[PDB]
Amino acid sequence: GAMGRRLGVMGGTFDPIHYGHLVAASEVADLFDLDEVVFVPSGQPVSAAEHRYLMTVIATASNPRFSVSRVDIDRGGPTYTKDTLADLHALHPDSELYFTTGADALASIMSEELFELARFVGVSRPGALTLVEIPALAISSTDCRQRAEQSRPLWYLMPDGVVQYVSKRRLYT
Amino acid sequence: GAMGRRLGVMGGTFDPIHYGHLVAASEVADLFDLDEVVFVPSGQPWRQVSAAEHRYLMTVIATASNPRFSVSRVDIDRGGPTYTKDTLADLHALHPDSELYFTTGADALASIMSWQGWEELFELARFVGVSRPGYELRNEHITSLLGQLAKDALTLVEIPALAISSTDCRQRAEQSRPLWYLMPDGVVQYVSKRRLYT
Numbered sequence: 001g002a003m004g005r006r007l008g009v010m011g012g013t014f015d016p017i018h019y020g021h022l023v024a025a026s027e028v029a030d031l032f033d034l035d036e037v038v039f040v041p042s043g044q045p046v047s048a049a050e051h052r053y054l055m056t057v058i059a060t061a062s063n064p065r066f067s068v069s070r071v072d073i074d075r076g077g078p079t080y081t082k083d084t085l086a087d088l089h090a091l092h093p094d095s096e097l098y099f100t101t102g103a104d105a106l107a108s109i110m111s112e113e114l115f116e117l118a119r120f121v122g123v124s125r126p127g128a129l130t131l132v133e134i135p136a137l138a139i140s141s142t143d144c145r146q147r148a149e150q151s152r153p154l155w156y157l158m159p160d161g162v163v164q165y166v167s168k169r170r171l172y173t
Numbered sequence: 174g175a176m177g178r179r180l181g182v183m184g185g186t187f188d189p190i191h192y193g194h195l196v197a198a199s200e201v202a203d204l205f206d207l208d209e210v211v212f213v214p215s216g217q218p219w220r221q222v223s224a225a226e227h228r229y230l231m232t233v234i235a236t237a238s239n240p241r242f243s244v245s246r247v248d249i250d251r252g253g254p255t256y257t258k259d260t261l262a263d264l265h266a267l268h269p270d271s272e273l274y275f276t277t278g279a280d281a282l283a284s285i286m287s288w289q290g291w292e293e294l295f296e297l298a299r300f301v302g303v304s305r306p307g308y309e310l311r312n313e314h315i316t317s318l319l320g321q322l323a324k325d326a327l328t329l330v331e332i333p334a335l336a337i338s339s340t341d342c343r344q345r346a347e348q349s350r351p352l353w354y355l356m357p358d359g360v361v362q363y364v365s366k367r368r369l370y371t
């Protein structure tokens with residue numbers, strides 16, 4: 001990008017992924033001049049990992065600057081962000097890494113050397129380490145699961161392909 | 174539908190249309206058992222908006238894939254300032270056997286409720302005010318007006334996705350910031366190709 005090789009790392013459970021996440025990634029990419037945003041579904045932080053992976057693949061497929069990595073899922077065991085960053089650094093060693101996730105998740109992970117590996121960006125609804133406010137994050141995976149539980153439509157909260165994956169695999173019923 | 178023939182009427186300026194609007198229409202359709210939602214881009218405002226045809230076309234682009242959404246020209250072709258009374262009369266004439274459910278933003282519905290002659294609107298349609306998070310009615314006259322209304326005549330529904338606003342979209346466009354995932358791809362491209370907020 002304009003500020004050198006930079007890579008977003010969008011950590012999350014994504015159960016399900018939705019337009020709030022996609023908007024957040026898109027915004028964070030623009031603000032920090034990122035070349036790409038790798039979505040990394042957590043292995044073990046909840047639907048099976050293959051579902052969360054495929055929903056993320058379906059959702060990001062059409063964007064040339066988004067991709068999905070299985071590094072946390074394929075590692076096995078609990079998911080640590082130091083391992084995610086190590087793996088992604090090994091793949092893109094000439095890029096500066098920008099780890100992006102929900103601000104609340106980011107408030108907990110800091111319970112040290114993580115800052116040697118990456119810059120951290122916390123996203124939330126409004127109200128080194130940077131906080132970015134995203135109005136579309138009023139959409140949440142919790143509402144999405146409840147709507148699916150109650151048989152209410154998910155249209156326009158997420159890509160059609162993800163609306164259909166959730167319905168076809170009966171994910172939250 | 175499950176409670177009879179019902180048509181959603183989704184009234185707005187739509188400058189631009191966004192996923193908020195589309196989520197709102199989809200949710201109200203489900204909540205009120207509506208067979209169809211007709212989007213009605215507004216004509217002249219009561220303020221500078223993009224030309225009516227742009228707003229018409231973004232709305233067509235955005236609703237095309239949905240079998241239950243359509244777009245009407247009745248307000249853009251009437252001319253003068255848009256009165257929802259005229260919208261409803263026109264749509265009533267066109268869909269004589271449907272109960273109409275006029276749906277718009279809660280703040281706009283309050284303005285409609287402030288207009289002299291509001292009573293005759295409820296002879297033509299039921300009303301749904303869609304609000305975003307943090308919405309509060311701060312009008313004691315309008316609050317008392319709600320008590321004049323029959324059961325199910327007016328319903329308020331909070332839609333988290335209406336945090337996305339047309340005002341924020343126009344600002345993002347003005348600031349060369351991406352609109353991806355706030356609105357359908359076709360609408361992002363329309364805005365860019367017609368250079369709407371430059």
Ligand SMILES: NC(=O)c1ccc[n+]([C@@H]2O[C@H](COP(=O)([O-])OP(=O)(O)OC[C@H]3O[C@@H](n4cnc5c(N)ncnc54)[C@H](OP(=O)(O)O)[C@@H]3O)[C@@H](O)[C@H]2O)c1
Nearest residue numbers: 010011012013042045079080081100101102104105140141
């Ligand atoms: N020890 C560790 O290294 C450790 C510990 C905890 C978390 N983490 C990491 O933190 C990340 C987040 O974990 P999680 O999703 O399981 O947290 P979570 O507890 O499921 O969610 C916390 C909040 O963050 C939001 N959120 C999560 N991921 C997001 C994203 N990428 N973009 C925007 N909002 C997002 C959530 O909204 P939605 O529900 O709508 O997504 C929710 O409001 C993962 O990469 C995980 O590996 C690491």
Ligand SMILES: NC(=O)c1ccc[n+]([C@@H]2O[C@H](COP(=O)([O-])OP(=O)(O)OC[C@H]3O[C@@H](n4cnc5c(N)ncnc54)[C@H](OP(=O)(O)O)[C@@H]3O)[C@@H](O)[C@H]2O)c1
Nearest residue numbers: 183184185186215255256257277278280281288338339340
């Ligand atoms: N006296 C009258 O009969 C009278 C007077 C005024 C308006 N109206 C009618 O009221 C409707 C709204 O007018 P407008 O768009 O010009 O109002 P507006 O002032 O531009 O909108 C006020 C608020 O309502 C939201 N909103 C508008 N239409 C919406 C919709 N269909 N669904 C969800 N949120 C919506 C707006 O969000 P966004 O910016 O994101 O859309 C904004 O937060 C139109 O059909 C208009 O003809 C009638």
